[PDB]
Coordinates of N, CA, C and O in Angstrom, one line a residue:
Chain J
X1 N 19.1 -2.7 34.1 CA 17.9 -3.3 33.7 C 18.1 -4.0 32.3 O 18.7 -3.5 31.4
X2 N 17.6 -5.2 32.2 CA 17.9 -6.1 31.0 C 17.3 -5.5 29.7 O 16.2 -5.1 29.7
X3 N 18.1 -5.5 28.7 CA 17.7 -5.0 27.4 C 17.1 -6.1 26.6 O 17.7 -7.2 26.5
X4 N 15.9 -5.9 26.0 CA 15.2 -6.9 25.2 C 15.2 -6.5 23.8 O 14.9 -5.4 23.4
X5 N 15.7 -7.4 22.9 CA 15.8 -7.1 21.5 C 14.5 -7.0 20.8 O 13.4 -7.2 21.4
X6 N 14.5 -6.6 19.5 CA 13.4 -6.6 18.7 C 13.5 -7.6 17.6 O 14.5 -7.7 16.9
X7 N 12.4 -8.4 17.4 CA 12.4 -9.3 16.2 C 12.1 -8.6 14.9 O 12.5 -9.1 13.9
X8 N 11.5 -7.4 15.0 CA 11.1 -6.7 13.8 C 12.0 -5.4 13.7 O 12.3 -4.7 14.7
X9 N 12.3 -5.0 12.5 CA 13.2 -3.8 12.3 C 12.4 -2.6 12.7 O 11.2 -2.5 12.5
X10 N 13.1 -1.6 13.3 CA 12.6 -0.4 13.7 C 12.4 0.6 12.5 O 11.8 0.2 11.5
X11 N 12.7 1.8 12.8 CA 12.6 2.9 11.7 C 13.8 3.1 10.9 O 13.8 3.9 10.0
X12 N 14.9 2.4 11.2 CA 16.1 2.6 10.5 C 16.2 1.6 9.3 O 15.1 1.1 8.9
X13 N 20.3 -32.3 59.6 CA 18.9 -32.6 59.1 C 19.0 -33.4 57.8 O 19.8 -33.1 56.9
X14 N 18.2 -34.5 57.7 CA 18.3 -35.4 56.5 C 17.5 -34.7 55.4 O 16.3 -34.3 55.6
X15 N 18.1 -34.6 54.2 CA 17.5 -34.1 53.1 C 16.5 -35.1 52.5 O 15.4 -34.7 52.0
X16 N 16.7 -36.4 52.6 CA 15.9 -37.4 51.9 C 14.5 -37.4 52.4 O 14.3 -37.4 53.6
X17 N 13.6 -37.4 51.4 CA 12.1 -37.4 51.7 C 11.5 -38.7 51.3 O 11.9 -39.2 50.3
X18 N 10.6 -39.3 52.1 CA 10.1 -40.6 51.8 C 9.6 -40.9 50.4 O 10.1 -41.8 49.7
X19 N 8.6 -40.1 50.0 CA 7.9 -40.6 48.7 C 8.5 -40.1 47.4 O 7.8 -40.2 46.4
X20 N 9.7 -39.5 47.4 CA 10.2 -38.8 46.2 C 10.9 -39.6 45.2 O 11.3 -39.1 44.2
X21 N 11.0 -40.9 45.4 CA 11.7 -41.8 44.5 C 10.9 -41.9 43.2 O 9.7 -41.9 43.2
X22 N 11.6 -42.2 42.1 CA 11.0 -42.1 40.8 C 11.0 -43.4 40.0 O 11.4 -43.5 38.9
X23 N 10.5 -44.5 40.7 CA 10.5 -45.8 40.1 C 9.2 -46.1 39.4 O 8.9 -47.3 39.0
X24 N 8.3 -45.1 39.1 CA 7.1 -45.3 38.4 C 7.3 -45.6 36.9 O 8.2 -45.1 36.3
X25 N 6.5 -46.5 36.4 CA 6.6 -47.0 35.0 C 5.3 -46.9 34.3 O 4.4 -47.8 34.5
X26 N 5.0 -45.9 33.6 CA 3.7 -45.7 32.9 C 4.0 -45.2 31.5 O 4.8 -44.3 31.2
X27 N 3.2 -45.7 30.5 CA 3.2 -45.3 29.1 C 1.8 -44.7 28.8 O 0.8 -45.3 29.2
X28 N 1.8 -43.6 28.1 CA 0.5 -42.9 27.8 C -0.2 -43.5 26.6 O 0.4 -44.2 25.7
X29 N -1.5 -43.3 26.6 CA -2.3 -43.8 25.5 C -3.5 -42.9 25.4 O -4.5 -43.0 26.1
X30 N -3.5 -41.9 24.4 CA -2.5 -41.7 23.4 C -1.2 -41.1 23.8 O -1.2 -40.5 24.9
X31 N -0.1 -41.3 23.1 CA 1.2 -40.9 23.5 C 1.3 -39.4 23.4 O 0.6 -38.7 22.7
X32 N 2.3 -38.9 24.2 CA 2.5 -37.5 24.4 C 3.0 -36.9 23.1 O 2.6 -35.8 22.6
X33 N 4.0 -37.6 22.4 CA 4.6 -37.0 21.3 C 3.7 -36.8 20.1 O 3.7 -35.8 19.4
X34 N 2.8 -37.8 19.9 CA 1.9 -37.8 18.7 C 1.0 -36.6 18.8 O 0.9 -35.8 17.9
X35 N 0.3 -36.4 19.9 CA -0.6 -35.3 20.1 C 0.1 -34.0 20.2 O -0.4 -33.0 19.8
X36 N 1.4 -34.0 20.7 CA 2.2 -32.8 20.7 C 2.5 -32.3 19.3 O 2.4 -31.1 19.1
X37 N 2.9 -33.2 18.4 CA 3.2 -32.8 17.1 C 1.9 -32.3 16.4 O 1.9 -31.3 15.6
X38 N 0.8 -33.0 16.6 CA -0.5 -32.6 15.9 C -0.9 -31.2 16.4 O -1.3 -30.3 15.6
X39 N -0.8 -31.0 17.7 CA -1.1 -29.7 18.3 C -0.2 -28.6 17.8 O -0.6 -27.4 17.6
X40 N 1.1 -28.9 17.7 CA 2.1 -28.0 17.1 C 1.6 -27.6 15.7 O 1.7 -26.4 15.3
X41 N 1.2 -28.5 14.9 CA 0.8 -28.2 13.5 C -0.5 -27.3 13.6 O -0.7 -26.5 12.7
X42 N -1.4 -27.6 14.6 CA -2.6 -26.8 14.6 C -2.4 -25.4 15.2 O -3.3 -24.5 15.0
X43 N -1.3 -25.2 15.9 CA -1.0 -23.9 16.5 C -0.8 -22.8 15.5 O -0.9 -21.6 15.8
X44 N -0.5 -23.1 14.2 CA -0.1 -22.1 13.3 C -1.2 -21.2 12.9 O -2.3 -21.6 12.6
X45 N -0.9 -19.9 12.9 CA -1.9 -18.9 12.4 C -2.0 -18.7 10.9 O -1.1 -19.3 10.2
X46 N -3.0 -18.0 10.5 CA -3.3 -17.9 9.1 C -2.3 -16.9 8.4 O -1.7 -16.1 9.0
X47 N -2.2 -17.1 7.1 CA -1.2 -16.3 6.3 C -1.8 -15.0 6.0 O -3.0 -14.8 5.8
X48 N -0.9 -14.0 5.8 CA -1.4 -12.6 5.5 C -1.6 -12.5 4.0 O -0.7 -12.8 3.2
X49 N -2.7 -12.0 3.6 CA -3.1 -11.8 2.2 C -3.1 -10.3 1.9 O -4.1 -9.6 2.1
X50 N -2.0 -9.8 1.4 CA -1.8 -8.4 1.1 C -2.0 -8.1 -0.3 O -1.6 -6.9 -0.7
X51 N -2.4 -9.0 -1.2 CA -2.6 -8.7 -2.6 C -3.7 -7.8 -2.8 O -4.8 -8.0 -2.3
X52 N -3.4 -6.7 -3.6 CA -4.4 -5.7 -3.9 C -4.4 -4.5 -3.0 O -5.3 -3.7 -3.1
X53 N -3.4 -4.4 -2.1 CA -3.3 -3.4 -1.1 C -2.2 -2.4 -1.4 O -1.3 -2.8 -2.2
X54 N -2.2 -1.2 -0.9 CA -1.2 -0.2 -1.3 C 0.2 -0.6 -0.8 O 0.4 -1.3 0.2
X55 N 1.2 0.0 -1.4 CA 2.6 0.0 -0.9 C 2.8 1.2 0.0 O 1.8 1.9 0.4
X56 N 4.0 1.4 0.5 CA 4.2 2.6 1.3 C 4.3 3.9 0.6 O 4.4 4.9 1.2
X57 N 4.3 3.9 -0.8 CA 4.3 5.1 -1.5 C 3.1 5.2 -2.5 O 3.0 6.1 -3.3
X58 N 2.1 4.2 -2.4 CA 0.9 4.3 -3.1 C 0.7 3.2 -4.2 O -0.5 3.0 -4.5
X59 N 1.8 2.6 -4.6 CA 1.6 1.5 -5.6 C 1.0 0.3 -5.1 O 1.1 0.0 -3.9
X60 N 0.3 -0.4 -5.9 CA -0.5 -1.6 -5.5 C 0.4 -2.8 -5.5 O 1.3 -3.0 -6.3
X61 N 0.1 -3.7 -4.5 CA 0.9 -4.9 -4.3 C 0.1 -6.1 -4.8 O -1.0 -6.3 -4.5
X62 N 0.8 -6.9 -5.7 CA 0.2 -8.1 -6.3 C 0.8 -8.3 -7.7 O 1.8 -7.8 -8.0
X63 N 0.0 -9.1 -8.5 CA 0.4 -9.4 -9.8 C -0.8 -9.0 -10.8 O -1.9 -8.9 -10.3
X64 N -0.4 -8.7 -12.0 CA -1.4 -8.1 -13.0 C -2.1 -9.3 -13.7 O -1.9 -9.6 -14.8
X65 N -3.1 -9.8 -12.9 CA -3.8 -11.0 -13.3 C -5.3 -10.7 -13.1 O -5.7 -10.0 -12.1
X66 N -6.2 -11.3 -13.9 CA -7.6 -11.1 -13.7 C -8.1 -11.8 -12.5 O -7.5 -12.7 -12.0
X67 N -9.2 -11.3 -11.9 CA -9.6 -11.7 -10.6 C -10.2 -13.2 -10.6 O -9.9 -14.0 -9.7
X68 N -11.1 -13.5 -11.6 CA -11.6 -14.8 -11.6 C -10.5 -15.8 -12.0 O -10.5 -17.0 -11.4
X69 N -9.6 -15.5 -12.9 CA -8.5 -16.3 -13.2 C -7.7 -16.5 -11.9 O -7.1 -17.6 -11.7
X70 N -7.6 -15.5 -11.1 CA -6.8 -15.5 -9.9 C -7.5 -16.5 -8.9 O -6.8 -17.4 -8.3
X71 N -8.8 -16.5 -8.8 CA -9.5 -17.5 -7.9 C -9.3 -18.9 -8.4 O -9.0 -19.8 -7.6
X72 N -9.4 -19.2 -9.7 CA -9.2 -20.5 -10.2 C -7.8 -21.0 -10.0 O -7.5 -22.2 -9.7
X73 N -6.8 -20.1 -10.2 CA -5.4 -20.4 -10.0 C -5.1 -20.8 -8.5 O -4.4 -21.8 -8.2
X74 N -5.7 -20.1 -7.6 CA -5.6 -20.3 -6.2 C -6.2 -21.7 -5.8 O -5.7 -22.4 -5.0
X75 N -7.4 -22.0 -6.4 CA -8.0 -23.3 -6.1 C -7.1 -24.4 -6.6 O -7.0 -25.4 -5.8
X76 N -6.5 -24.3 -7.8 CA -5.6 -25.3 -8.2 C -4.4 -25.5 -7.3 O -4.0 -26.6 -7.0
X77 N -3.8 -24.4 -6.9 CA -2.7 -24.4 -6.0 C -3.0 -25.1 -4.7 O -2.2 -25.9 -4.2
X78 N -4.2 -24.8 -4.1 CA -4.6 -25.4 -2.8 C -4.8 -26.9 -3.0 O -4.4 -27.7 -2.1
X79 N -5.4 -27.3 -4.1 CA -5.6 -28.7 -4.3 C -4.3 -29.5 -4.4 O -4.1 -30.6 -3.9
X80 N -3.3 -28.9 -5.2 CA -2.0 -29.5 -5.3 C -1.3 -29.6 -3.9 O -0.7 -30.6 -3.6
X81 N -1.4 -28.6 -3.1 CA -0.9 -28.7 -1.7 C -1.6 -29.7 -0.9 O -0.9 -30.4 -0.1
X82 N -2.9 -29.9 -1.0 CA -3.5 -31.0 -0.3 C -3.0 -32.4 -0.8 O -2.7 -33.2 0.1
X83 N -2.8 -32.6 -2.1 CA -2.3 -33.8 -2.6 C -0.9 -34.0 -2.1 O -0.5 -35.2 -1.7
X84 N -0.1 -33.0 -2.0 CA 1.3 -33.1 -1.4 C 1.2 -33.5 0.1 O 2.0 -34.3 0.6
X85 N 0.2 -32.9 0.8 CA 0.2 -33.2 2.3 C -0.3 -34.6 2.6 O 0.2 -35.2 3.5
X86 N -1.2 -35.1 1.8 CA -1.6 -36.5 2.1 C -0.7 -37.5 1.4 O -1.0 -38.7 1.5
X87 N 0.3 -37.1 0.7 CA 1.3 -37.9 0.0 C 0.8 -38.6 -1.2 O 1.5 -39.4 -1.9
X88 N -0.5 -38.4 -1.6 CA -1.0 -39.1 -2.8 C -0.7 -38.3 -4.0 O -0.2 -37.1 -4.0
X89 N -0.8 -38.9 -5.2 CA -0.7 -38.2 -6.5 C -1.9 -37.4 -6.7 O -1.8 -36.2 -7.2
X90 N -3.1 -37.9 -6.5 CA -4.3 -37.2 -6.7 C -5.0 -36.9 -5.3 O -5.1 -37.9 -4.6
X91 N -5.4 -35.7 -5.1 CA -6.1 -35.4 -3.8 C -7.5 -36.0 -3.7 O -8.2 -36.0 -4.7
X92 N -7.8 -36.5 -2.6 CA -9.1 -37.0 -2.3 C -10.1 -35.9 -2.1 O -11.3 -36.0 -2.4
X93 N -9.7 -34.8 -1.4 CA -10.5 -33.7 -1.1 C -9.9 -32.5 -2.0 O -8.8 -32.1 -1.8
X94 N -10.8 -32.0 -2.8 CA -10.4 -31.1 -3.9 C -11.2 -29.8 -3.8 O -12.3 -29.8 -3.4
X95 N -10.5 -28.7 -4.2 CA -11.1 -27.4 -4.2 C -11.5 -26.9 -5.6 O -12.2 -25.9 -5.7
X96 N -11.0 -27.6 -6.6 CA -11.3 -27.2 -8.0 C -12.1 -28.4 -8.6 O -12.2 -29.5 -8.1
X97 N -12.8 -28.1 -9.7 CA -13.7 -29.0 -10.4 C -14.8 -29.6 -9.5 O -15.3 -30.7 -9.9
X98 N -15.1 -29.0 -8.4 CA -16.2 -29.3 -7.7 C -17.5 -29.0 -8.5 O -17.5 -28.2 -9.3
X99 N -18.5 -29.8 -8.2 CA -19.7 -29.8 -9.1 C -20.6 -28.6 -9.0 O -21.7 -28.6 -9.5
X100 N -20.0 -27.5 -8.4 CA -20.8 -26.2 -8.2 C -20.4 -25.3 -9.3 O -19.2 -25.0 -9.5
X101 N -21.3 -24.7 -10.0 CA -21.1 -23.7 -11.0 C -20.8 -22.3 -10.3 O -21.6 -21.5 -10.1
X102 N -19.5 -22.2 -9.9 CA -19.1 -21.0 -9.2 C -18.3 -20.0 -10.0 O -17.2 -19.7 -9.7
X103 N -18.9 -19.6 -11.1 CA -18.2 -18.9 -12.2 C -18.1 -17.4 -12.0 O -17.4 -16.7 -12.7
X104 N -18.9 -16.8 -11.0 CA -18.9 -15.4 -10.7 C -17.9 -15.0 -9.6 O -17.9 -13.9 -9.2
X105 N -17.2 -16.0 -9.1 CA -16.3 -15.7 -7.9 C -15.2 -14.8 -8.2 O -14.6 -14.9 -9.3
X106 N -14.9 -13.9 -7.3 CA -13.8 -12.9 -7.5 C -12.8 -13.0 -6.4 O -13.2 -13.3 -5.2
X107 N -11.6 -12.7 -6.7 CA -10.5 -12.7 -5.7 C -9.7 -11.4 -5.9 O -9.6 -10.8 -7.0
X108 N -9.0 -11.0 -4.8 CA -8.1 -9.8 -4.9 C -6.9 -10.1 -5.8 O -6.4 -11.2 -5.9
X109 N -6.4 -9.0 -6.4 CA -5.3 -9.1 -7.3 C -4.7 -7.7 -7.5 O -5.2 -6.7 -6.9
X110 N -3.6 -7.6 -8.2 CA -3.0 -6.4 -8.5 C -3.4 -5.7 -9.7 O -2.8 -4.7 -10.1
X111 N -4.5 -6.1 -10.3 CA -5.0 -5.5 -11.6 C -5.8 -4.3 -11.4 O -6.1 -3.6 -12.4
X112 N -6.2 -3.9 -10.2 CA -7.0 -2.7 -10.0 C -6.5 -1.9 -8.8 O -5.9 -2.5 -7.9
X113 N -6.7 -0.6 -8.8 CA -6.3 0.2 -7.7 C -7.6 0.6 -6.9 O -8.7 0.1 -7.1
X114 N -7.4 1.5 -5.9 CA -8.4 1.8 -4.9 C -9.6 2.6 -5.5 O -10.7 2.5 -5.1
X115 N -9.3 3.4 -6.5 CA -10.4 4.2 -7.2 C -11.1 3.4 -8.2 O -12.0 4.0 -8.9
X116 N -10.8 2.2 -8.5 CA -11.5 1.4 -9.4 C -10.9 1.3 -10.8 O -11.4 0.6 -11.7
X117 N -9.7 2.0 -11.0 CA -9.1 1.9 -12.3 C -8.1 0.8 -12.4 O -7.9 0.0 -11.5
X118 N -7.5 0.6 -13.6 CA -6.5 -0.4 -13.8 C -5.1 0.0 -13.5 O -4.8 1.2 -13.6
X119 N -4.3 -1.0 -13.1 CA -2.9 -0.7 -12.9 C -2.1 -1.1 -14.1 O -1.1 -1.9 -14.0
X120 N -2.5 -0.6 -15.2 CA -1.6 -0.7 -16.4 C -0.4 0.1 -16.3 O 0.6 -0.2 -16.9
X121 N -0.4 1.1 -15.4 CA 0.7 1.9 -15.1 C 0.7 2.3 -13.6 O -0.4 2.7 -13.2
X122 N 1.8 2.2 -12.9 CA 1.7 2.5 -11.5 C 1.2 3.9 -11.1 O 1.4 4.8 -11.9
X123 N 0.6 4.0 -10.0 CA 0.0 5.3 -9.6 C 1.1 6.4 -9.5 O 0.8 7.5 -9.9
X124 N 2.2 6.1 -9.0 CA 3.3 7.1 -8.8 C 3.7 7.6 -10.2 O 3.9 8.8 -10.3
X125 N 3.7 6.8 -11.2 CA 4.0 7.2 -12.6 C 3.0 8.2 -13.1 O 3.3 9.2 -13.7
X126 N 1.7 7.9 -12.9 CA 0.6 8.8 -13.3 C 0.7 10.1 -12.6 O 0.5 11.2 -13.2
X127 N 1.0 10.1 -11.3 CA 1.2 11.4 -10.6 C 2.3 12.2 -11.2 O 2.2 13.4 -11.4
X128 N 3.4 11.5 -11.5 CA 4.6 12.2 -12.0 C 4.3 12.8 -13.4 O 4.7 14.0 -13.6
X129 N 3.6 12.1 -14.3 CA 3.3 12.7 -15.6 C 2.3 13.8 -15.5 O 2.5 14.9 -16.1
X130 N 1.3 13.6 -14.7 CA 0.3 14.7 -14.5 C 0.9 16.0 -13.9 O 0.5 17.1 -14.2
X131 N 1.9 15.8 -13.1 CA 2.6 16.9 -12.5 C 3.6 17.5 -13.6 O 3.6 18.7 -13.7
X132 N 4.2 16.7 -14.3 CA 5.2 17.2 -15.3 C 4.5 18.0 -16.4 O 5.2 18.8 -17.0
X133 N 3.2 17.8 -16.6 CA 2.5 18.5 -17.6 C 2.4 20.0 -17.3 O 2.0 20.8 -18.2
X134 N 2.7 20.4 -16.1 CA 2.4 21.8 -15.7 C 3.6 22.6 -15.3 O 3.6 23.8 -14.9
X135 N 4.8 22.0 -15.5 CA 6.1 22.7 -15.2 C 6.3 23.9 -16.1 O 5.9 23.9 -17.3
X136 N 7.1 24.9 -15.6 CA 7.5 26.0 -16.4 C 9.0 26.3 -16.1 O 9.5 26.0 -15.0
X137 N 9.6 27.0 -17.0 CA 11.1 27.2 -17.0 C 11.5 28.6 -16.9 O 10.6 29.5 -17.0
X138 N 12.8 28.9 -16.8 CA 13.3 30.2 -16.8 C 13.1 30.9 -18.1 O 13.2 30.2 -19.2
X139 N 12.8 32.2 -18.2 CA 12.6 32.9 -19.5 C 13.9 32.9 -20.3 O 15.0 32.9 -19.8
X140 N 13.7 32.8 -21.6 CA 14.8 32.6 -22.6 C 15.8 33.7 -22.5 O 16.9 33.5 -22.0
Chain K
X1 N -8.3 34.9 -11.0 CA -8.3 35.5 -12.3 C -7.4 36.7 -12.4 O -7.7 37.8 -13.0
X2 N -6.2 36.7 -11.7 CA -5.3 37.8 -11.7 C -4.5 37.8 -13.0 O -3.5 37.1 -13.2
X3 N -4.9 38.6 -13.9 CA -4.2 38.8 -15.2 C -3.5 40.1 -15.2 O -3.9 41.1 -14.6
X4 N -2.3 40.1 -16.0 CA -1.4 41.2 -16.0 C -1.3 41.8 -17.4 O -1.2 41.1 -18.3
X5 N -1.4 43.1 -17.5 CA -1.3 43.8 -18.7 C -0.1 44.8 -18.7 O 0.0 45.6 -17.8
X6 N 0.7 44.6 -19.7 CA 1.9 45.5 -19.8 C 1.5 46.9 -20.1 O 0.4 47.2 -20.6
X7 N 2.4 47.9 -19.8 CA 2.2 49.3 -20.2 C 2.7 49.5 -21.6 O 3.3 48.7 -22.2
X8 N 2.4 50.8 -22.0 CA 2.8 51.2 -23.3 C 3.2 52.7 -23.3 O 2.5 53.5 -22.8
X9 N 4.4 53.0 -23.8 CA 4.9 54.3 -23.9 C 4.9 55.1 -22.6 O 4.6 56.3 -22.6
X10 N 5.3 54.4 -21.5 CA 5.4 55.0 -20.2 C 4.2 54.7 -19.3 O 4.3 55.0 -18.1
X11 N 3.1 54.2 -19.8 CA 2.0 53.8 -19.0 C 2.4 52.6 -18.1 O 3.1 51.8 -18.6
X12 N 1.9 52.6 -16.9 CA 2.3 51.6 -15.9 C 1.6 50.3 -16.1 O 0.4 50.3 -16.5
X13 N 2.2 49.2 -15.8 CA 1.5 47.9 -15.9 C 0.4 47.8 -14.8 O 0.5 48.4 -13.7
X14 N -0.6 46.9 -15.1 CA -1.7 46.8 -14.2 C -2.0 45.3 -14.0 O -1.8 44.5 -14.8
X15 N -2.7 45.0 -12.8 CA -3.1 43.7 -12.4 C -4.6 43.7 -12.1 O -5.1 44.7 -11.7
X16 N -5.2 42.6 -12.4 CA -6.7 42.5 -12.3 C -7.1 42.2 -10.9 O -6.7 41.2 -10.3
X17 N -7.9 43.1 -10.3 CA -8.5 43.0 -9.0 C -9.6 42.1 -8.9 O -10.2 41.6 -9.9
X18 N -10.1 41.7 -7.7 CA -11.2 40.8 -7.5 C -12.5 41.4 -7.9 O -13.4 40.8 -8.5
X19 N -12.7 42.7 -7.6 CA -14.0 43.4 -7.9 C -14.1 43.6 -9.4 O -15.2 43.9 -9.8
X20 N -13.1 43.4 -10.2 CA -13.1 43.6 -11.6 C -12.3 44.8 -12.1 O -12.5 45.1 -13.3
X21 N -11.5 45.4 -11.3 CA -10.8 46.6 -11.8 C -9.3 46.2 -12.0 O -8.8 45.1 -11.6
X22 N -8.6 47.1 -12.7 CA -7.2 46.9 -13.0 C -6.4 48.0 -12.2 O -6.7 49.2 -12.4
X23 N -5.4 47.6 -11.4 CA -4.7 48.5 -10.6 C -3.2 48.4 -10.8 O -2.7 47.4 -11.2
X24 N -2.4 49.5 -10.6 CA -1.0 49.5 -10.8 C -0.2 48.8 -9.7 O -0.8 48.4 -8.7
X25 N 1.1 48.5 -10.0 CA 1.9 47.8 -9.0 C 2.3 48.7 -7.8 O 3.4 49.2 -7.7
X26 N 1.4 48.9 -6.9 CA 1.6 49.7 -5.7 C 0.5 49.4 -4.7 O -0.6 48.9 -5.0
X27 N 0.8 49.6 -3.4 CA -0.1 49.5 -2.4 C -0.1 48.3 -1.5 O 1.0 47.6 -1.4
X28 N -1.2 47.9 -1.0 CA -1.3 46.7 -0.1 C -2.2 45.7 -0.9 O -3.4 46.0 -1.2
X29 N -1.7 44.5 -1.1 CA -2.5 43.4 -1.8 C -2.7 42.3 -0.8 O -2.0 42.1 0.2
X30 N -3.7 41.4 -1.2 CA -3.9 40.2 -0.5 C -3.8 39.0 -1.5 O -4.5 39.0 -2.5
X31 N -2.9 38.1 -1.2 CA -2.8 36.9 -2.1 C -3.0 35.6 -1.3 O -2.5 35.5 -0.2
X32 N -3.7 34.7 -1.8 CA -3.5 33.3 -1.4 C -2.3 32.7 -2.0 O -1.7 33.1 -3.0
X33 N -1.7 31.6 -1.3 CA -0.5 31.0 -1.8 C -0.6 30.4 -3.1 O 0.4 30.2 -3.9
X34 N -1.8 29.9 -3.4 CA -2.0 29.2 -4.7 C -1.7 30.1 -5.9 O -1.2 29.5 -6.9
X35 N -1.9 31.4 -5.8 CA -1.5 32.3 -6.9 C -0.1 32.3 -7.2 O 0.3 32.1 -8.4
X36 N 0.8 32.4 -6.2 CA 2.2 32.4 -6.4 C 2.7 31.0 -6.8 O 3.6 30.9 -7.6
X37 N 2.0 30.0 -6.3 CA 2.4 28.6 -6.8 C 2.1 28.4 -8.2 O 2.9 27.7 -8.9
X38 N 1.0 28.9 -8.7 CA 0.6 28.7 -10.1 C 1.4 29.5 -11.1 O 1.7 29.0 -12.2
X39 N 1.8 30.7 -10.7 CA 2.5 31.6 -11.6 C 3.9 32.0 -11.0 O 4.2 33.2 -10.8
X40 N 4.7 31.0 -10.6 CA 6.0 31.3 -9.9 C 6.9 32.2 -10.8 O 7.3 33.3 -10.4
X41 N 7.2 31.7 -12.0 CA 8.2 32.4 -12.9 C 7.7 33.8 -13.3 O 8.4 34.8 -13.2
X42 N 6.5 33.8 -13.8 CA 6.0 35.1 -14.4 C 5.9 36.1 -13.3 O 6.3 37.3 -13.4
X43 N 5.3 35.8 -12.1 CA 5.2 36.7 -11.0 C 6.5 37.2 -10.5 O 6.7 38.3 -10.2
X44 N 7.5 36.2 -10.4 CA 8.8 36.6 -10.0 C 9.4 37.7 -10.9 O 9.8 38.8 -10.5
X45 N 9.4 37.4 -12.2 CA 9.9 38.4 -13.2 C 9.2 39.7 -13.1 O 9.9 40.8 -13.3
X46 N 7.9 39.7 -13.0 CA 7.2 41.0 -13.0 C 7.4 41.8 -11.7 O 7.5 43.0 -11.7
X47 N 7.4 41.1 -10.5 CA 7.2 41.8 -9.3 C 8.5 42.1 -8.6 O 8.6 43.2 -7.9
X48 N 9.5 41.2 -8.7 CA 10.6 41.3 -7.7 C 11.3 42.7 -7.6 O 11.6 43.1 -6.5
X49 N 11.4 43.3 -8.7 CA 12.1 44.7 -8.7 C 11.2 45.7 -7.9 O 11.7 46.5 -7.1

């Protein structure tokens, strides 16, 4: 039985028939290739946003940046990508500097953990110190 | 609240019971594991013999 690999790492009589000739000459409108490439670009799924979520040992994934600053930084990045995609220097469709006073907006980041505290120091480090405070040794 | 008091001049050491009494190192005792986890070294030194 055929073995299927894993893309993701584990835990480690005359034959001739009358009408079959191929002398038809037709061009499509719209063409097949153009719509095929556009559909290929539309097939792509959305990106995974894991910022602000735990690691496999408890530490938070992301960067130590404020949330509103994070939202504005992401808006700038998306606008630059739009300008790149339409090949212009300045984007016609923009996500920043829109005329809406959207100053309370928040985005995920690595600056907070799940209990609401700050990640000035990783969670595993805090566990280690809180445990080290209670150790005892062999009598002198 | 299991506290241990040393003996003096031949008097035997005693340990604090739940009802509030102090009893010597003999008999049948009931411990949760948290007690030995909290006082590993002290309990080892006092009891093992």
